[PDB]
Amino acid sequence: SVLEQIDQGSILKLPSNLLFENATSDAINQDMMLYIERIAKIIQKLPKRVHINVRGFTDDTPLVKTRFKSHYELAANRAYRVMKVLIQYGVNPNQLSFSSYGSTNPIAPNDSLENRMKNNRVEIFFSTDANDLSKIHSILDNEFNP
Amino acid sequence: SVLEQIDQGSILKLPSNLLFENATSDAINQDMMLYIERIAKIIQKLPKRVHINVRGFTDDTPLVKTRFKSHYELAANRAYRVMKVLIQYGVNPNQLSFSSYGSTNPIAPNDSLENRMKNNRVEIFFSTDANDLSKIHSILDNEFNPH
């Protein structure tokens, strides 16, 4: 699915070759722009405390004819560009950040065309900074340990 | 107390204003490297399912003595350098990533130097990708709510 759940938040998975003109570009295709607007709009309906981290991943195919010096960098620029478009479409900048995994920790091994493709993605990870449990513990800790 | 807990994980706050040559640089002061080695040393006392994210934050002071074109970029490069020094000292690349908040999410209002200086931060966040509860919910959703 485009949507996956883990215990500390939600992940929207956007394949990089739908998003970007080519293997080393960070320019977003016109036909996906309003798909990102649609993500910005649904963000406006989420709990006030939601944080949105735009995450870049790449396969490990060596970089060729590009100003980008590493996968880390390509992934960073990609996640950043998607985050920028979310801001254009009205998302509060104080609810956003971007991240880069480069070619590390792939979804699939980098040994087929299909697999490398899965490793090429931007994930939009939705979580919150909740700390009630942490406050609870700390207050009880200070009360019951010296 | 360089350590803060939130319900999804742990936040280690680095002495960022000491680690970097100046506040608009991404070059680490070589004298301070021991501090990053120290952290690196301890990370291996953590299981490999732990994910380690280095994140950069800055004040909103207009950029000055730098090739970088934005706060987002300065904070990214700083988080990245720390991430790279962690790799240097043995931390597994497959557990590591870096993030930038630029000048967003200040911890203090940007309205005095000392407050501004508080907003320049590098932090390491520790978490996991646990999905038991989600799997449990999904199993029960398919069963009692089939589509």
Side-chain angles (χ1 to χ4, degrees):
Chain A
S1 188
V2 61
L3 176 71
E4 184 184 340
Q5 196 186 26
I6 55 171
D7 301 359
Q8 296 296 155
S10 290
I11 303 160
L12 242 29
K13 316 215 283 207
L14 312 169
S16 283
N17 35 72
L18 279 184
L19 272 179
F20 302 102
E21 301 188 331
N22 61 65
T24 64
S25 170
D26 70 350
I28 292 162
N29 296 317
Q30 281 298 293
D31 69 331
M32 279 289 99
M33 283 295 293
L34 294 206
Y35 191 75
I36 299 160
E37 175 185 56
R38 174 185 178 186
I39 297 156
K41 283 175 152 180
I42 205 69
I43 283 164
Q44 263 56 105
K45 284 154 195 315
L46 298 174
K48 275 82 100 71
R49 307 144 294 260
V50 76
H51 178 92
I52 300 101
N53 181 217
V54 183
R55 300 176 164 191
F57 309 79
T58 62
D59 68 29
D60 65 3
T61 307
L63 299 175
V64 129
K65 18 163 174 70
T66 163
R67 75 196 185 87
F68 300 127
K69 302 165 265 259
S70 58
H71 294 112
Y72 286 132
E73 188 181 6
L74 168 58
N77 279 273
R78 247 114 100 133
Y80 173 75
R81 204 69 51 192
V82 178
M83 186 199 72
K84 265 292 221 266
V85 180
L86 290 170
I87 288 163
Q88 275 182 36
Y89 285 131
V91 179
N92 184 3
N94 300 321
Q95 291 180 96
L96 285 157
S97 67
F98 66 99
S99 302
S100 170
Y101 292 74
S103 54
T104 73
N105 206 237
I107 271 176
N110 286 290
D111 66 19
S112 81
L113 199 73
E114 308 68 27
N115 280 359
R116 293 167 174 122
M117 186 148 128
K118 305 176 175 303
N119 293 159
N120 247 264
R121 64 187 192 283
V122 169
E123 292 176 1
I124 299 184
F125 177 79
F126 299 76
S127 63
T128 90
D129 49 340
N131 70 344
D132 274 356
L133 298 174
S134 309
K135 298 205 279 301
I136 285 161
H137 192 68
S138 152
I139 287 157
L140 290 170
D141 187 56
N142 279 108
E143 179 64 22
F144 297 98
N145 305 136
Chain B
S1 165
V2 300
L3 188 70
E4 196 192 317
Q5 197 179 18
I6 53 163
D7 298 355
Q8 62 168 310
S10 292
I11 302 168
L12 187 59
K13 319 200 232 264
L14 311 190
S16 130
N17 307 328
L18 270 20
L19 294 181
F20 293 95
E21 294 193 342
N22 66 60
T24 63
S25 177
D26 72 336
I28 276 140
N29 175 341
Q30 298 303 124
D31 290 347
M32 300 307 150
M33 293 275 289
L34 68 77
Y35 193 90
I36 307 176
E37 189 278 339
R38 188 304 184 55
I39 295 153
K41 190 79 172 181
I42 300 306
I43 273 161
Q44 304 148 32
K45 286 171 67 171
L46 319 163
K48 82 246 81 168
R49 74 203 152 270
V50 180
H51 298 303
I52 306 158
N53 188 70
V54 190
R55 36 200 45 200
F57 308 76
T58 69
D59 62 34
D60 79 344
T61 297
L63 258 7
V64 129
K65 199 65 196 171
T66 187
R67 57 189 250 245
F68 300 126
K69 319 282 206 227
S70 62
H71 293 115
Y72 282 124
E73 189 182 1
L74 168 68
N77 279 275
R78 282 157 79 106
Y80 176 72
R81 290 295 155 198
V82 178
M83 191 195 73
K84 283 285 274 169
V85 185
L86 287 175
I87 296 178
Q88 240 192 76
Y89 291 121
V91 181
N92 180 206
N94 279 29
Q95 268 149 27
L96 273 164
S97 63
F98 68 96
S99 303
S100 169
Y101 296 69
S103 71
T104 76
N105 275 335
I107 236 297
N110 281 299
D111 76 5
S112 72
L113 184 110
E114 45 258 53
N115 278 346
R116 272 165 210 139
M117 184 173 132
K118 280 181 190 181
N119 288 322
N120 291 305
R121 335 191 290 282
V122 182
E123 300 174 347
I124 308 177
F125 177 67
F126 299 81
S127 62
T128 78
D129 282 346
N131 69 347
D132 287 287
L133 300 173
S134 312
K135 279 196 221 141
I136 288 157
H137 180 80
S138 192
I139 291 173
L140 292 165
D141 186 56
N142 296 339
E143 182 65 27
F144 296 96
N145 229 269
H147 302 135

